[PDB]
Amino acid sequence: SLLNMRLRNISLKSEHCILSSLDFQTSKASEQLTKKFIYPQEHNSFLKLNFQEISYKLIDGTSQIELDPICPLKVPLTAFSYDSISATFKLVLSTQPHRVKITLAYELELHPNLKLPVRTSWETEVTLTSLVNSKLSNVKFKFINSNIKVIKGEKFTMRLQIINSSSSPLDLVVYYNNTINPIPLTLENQYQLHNKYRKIAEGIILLSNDYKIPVVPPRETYFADLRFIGIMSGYYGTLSGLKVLDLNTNELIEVGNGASVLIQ
Amino acid sequence: AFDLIIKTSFTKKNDQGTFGETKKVRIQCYLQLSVSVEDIFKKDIFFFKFLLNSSVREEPVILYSSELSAPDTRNDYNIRGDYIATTPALITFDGNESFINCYEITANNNFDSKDIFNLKVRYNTLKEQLDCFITDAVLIEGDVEWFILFEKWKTFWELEILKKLKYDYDAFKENRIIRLLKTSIDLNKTKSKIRNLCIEKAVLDKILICLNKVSRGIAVCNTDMDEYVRNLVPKQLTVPVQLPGFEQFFHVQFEQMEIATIGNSLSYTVIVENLSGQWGQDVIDDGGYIFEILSSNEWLIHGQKRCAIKEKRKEFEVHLIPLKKGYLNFPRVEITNINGKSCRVDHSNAFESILIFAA
Amino acid sequence: SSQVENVDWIEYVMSKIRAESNLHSRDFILLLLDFRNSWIDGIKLNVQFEDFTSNEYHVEASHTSRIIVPIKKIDYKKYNFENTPIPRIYPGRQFIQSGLNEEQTIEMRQKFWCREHIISKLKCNWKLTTDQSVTGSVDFNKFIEKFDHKMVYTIYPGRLFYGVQLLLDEPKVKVGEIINLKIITEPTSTCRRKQNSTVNFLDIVIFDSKTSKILPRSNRRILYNGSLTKPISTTKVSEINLEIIPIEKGRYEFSVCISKSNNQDGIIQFDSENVILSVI
Secondary structure, eight states, X not given: OOXXXXXXXXXXXXXXXXXXXXXXXXXXXXXXXXXXXXXXXXXXXXXXXXXXXXXXXXXXXXXEEEOOOSSOOOSSOEEESSOEEEEEEEEOOOOOOOOEEEEEEEEEOXXXXXXXXXXXXXXXXXXXXXXXXXXXXXXEEEETTOOOEEOTTSEEEEEEEEEEOSSSOBOOEEEEOOSOOOOOOOHHHHHHHHHHHHHHHTTEEETTTXXXXXXXXXXEEEEEEEEEXXXXXXXXXXXXXXXXXXXXXTBOOOGGGGOEXXXX | OEEEEEEOOXXXXXXXXXXXXXXXXXXXXXXXXXXXXXXXXXXXXXXXXEEEEESSTTOOEEEEEOOOBOOTTSSOOEEEOOOEEEEXXXXXXXXXXXXXXXXXXXXXXXXXXXXXXXXXXXXXXXXHHHXXXXXXXXXXXXXXXXXHHHGGGHHHIIIIITTTOOBOHHHHHHHOOOOBOTTSOOHHHHHHHHHHSOOOHHHHHHHHHHHXXXXXXXXXXXXXXXXXXXXSOOEEOOOEEOOOOOSEEEEEEEEEOOOBOTTOOEEEEEEEEEOOGGGSSOOOTTSOEEEEEOOOTTEEEEEEEEEEEOSSEEEEEEEEEEOSSSOEEOOOEEEOOSSSOOEEEEETTSSOEEOBOOO | OOSOOOSHHHHHHXXXXXXXXXXXXXXXXXXXXXXXXOSSSOEEEEEEOSSOBOOOEEEOTTOEEEEOOXXXXXXXXXXXXXXXXXXXXXXXXXXXXOOOOHHHHHHHHHHHHHHHHTTSSOEEEOOBSSOTTOOOBOOSTTTOOOOOHHHHHHHOTTSXXXXXXXXXXXXXXXXXXXXXXXXXXXXXXTHHHHOOOSEEEEEOOOBOSSSOOBOOSSOSSEEOSSOSOEEEESSSOEEEEOOOEEOSSEEEOOOEEEESOSSSSOEEEEEOOOOOEEEO
């Protein structure tokens, strides 16, 4: 069994999937057995595994279905000593764990006469922000296009969705802060922090600053049509400064976390 | 530091007498400056980086020149990056003042890891320079009739009082104030010492006010004290350095095929080749030199993650899949030998990033 | 860039820097005015300054419109607001002190004259949307409140301590070539009286530009001779230069940070000026 393998699947909430990535490599048993019977008299020998077929199958009860990989995987692939080949599969995702089967059909090719077949297999289970809500309230916020790319200098528009279902209309007011946040750390980290705060402060401007969103009646929605223009090339992932104030309980929720402006 | 006794018995011809003194001295057999090499390898050009530093907490030094001389064995590498200081550069024991001296070396035929390079750094201690400053500026300012009078006791002045002083190096480093420590020297007994010697009255007076004034902390920083090191002899610390020993040299290049949203394959082709012929050592296209792309928590690799290098030039495709939001570095790579050997890797684009822009 | 020249302010700034190519883009600021229309009907705005005119802005009733009007920074070298007492428009009354030490009065004087500079230079007109012949104007003496610290820092660079300046040979160089940068540094009027000293230190901290991440001190991307930290006099213009050697392809920012002393905190200013070089 010189095919030690692993499954280190990682979740991805952004696109709503889980990426399962098998990775099989020649184990230390191959190193131990290479200089024992494969080619004892030679000094630097190697194995010559050939993989007939690799299957990643989704199973539920008696039914099974094969899953194709993300990028193509040339099936009749060769393999020598000290190799590690990995394949990735995408399956869309609550509390219903999946059941999958992995089967590798391969054969060693000691001389071009004989081929020992192997059909190792085993089953297992596939087991292991953009939307922002308001604390001490039920109102919820989401940008229609949180991922916007525009040429720097040109003014762009970002559509903010408001959900109201709590009890009563809100009088929230939105603004962008264009002042350098005072710094609180060594000189290195402190200057990094200052540069980040400066870039946040004087990078983007909201051309409708201090917009009074008029009314958001209960159990309804509203589109705050914010309008911006950028002046510094860069990537403003989860931009701060765009914070919305609620004029009922002085909430200073950071609504800008669901914005990923990129400008050249 | 140790003690030494010298004794002489010289004789002259004009007189008949046999003269000769017997002096007892204390010699400081400690190296003030400390050097630590750090080298960077890149394809067909080699880089040095010396982190020059002081070796004592309270004896900062000053640097003048650090030109690295090539070996005299042959018409070898053309060095490029020698440093000549317009003004002396201060360096202390440790802090956020890392003095870096970097060189760029280009070979003509090939490298050889048995040559010896010489650094040849010239320097002085801050104490010596500031001693020259005090003994030339605060004491003999634009005077000749007084200096000829004072010349009688110059060797005493530079040995019993000037040597015993202790300078507030922290104060100089902070505000460049030339002040003594509190427990530096007791004037109440120093005055008694000078009085015990036969000394001219005005000379005694000027020495007393000089010591008092400098104890008060004169703070001339940059308007002066840069024309007085001319008469100060520099120390020199020619130290040898050699290129590190290694068995093989590889460089790996990731080439884009045909910005990049999250969860999408990016087709890259890695080119690995053993460029050891450039550095003398012949290629070894059969060694146990496994090459693996270290999978991080922000890059999923699809394809041949690991493979054994058994060819002069190897190339194969590989598809990368990002996981995090944006501006991710390339996945790290390493080439390691199986048995015990060591080799050097030149990742062509170690510090390069892709802007992942989700959806 | 040249593609986005449609809006008025960017086009004005471009024509100014191109036609007078000695000013960098740093010698310009916006003003970010916001006119709130309290009239029942809409009004067409047309804001004006020294030379340029803004295109028409239609501001409908009870709705604010954020107007951009660029300004050239005022230079302390040829205005001398430091010693210029506030005018007394009804002289003849005897003199009674309000009571203010030197720092408070110089602060107030700078704020007042800074405000007054951009009141006698900025204007706008009217056109009622319904009836086009109801033109008029609006003053700014009764709207523009007193300035604050940030508003004076941005427009009046004499408030800052040092007016440093950076430049390179060319912002394009291959891998493995010395390319020196020289940093000029002139103290301002604020430094010559606010604090007594003879040496202040500055740093030549370097950023990745693209990722906007500060590089380490002893990095493997930019090799240089000598320490980044070095003193500068607080009275005379000081010139320093470095021996930057690029190692890998990329872009770097080369900011500057002036400090009072090398003891952790106690930094005078973080200047925003920077010069970018791209190595390839």
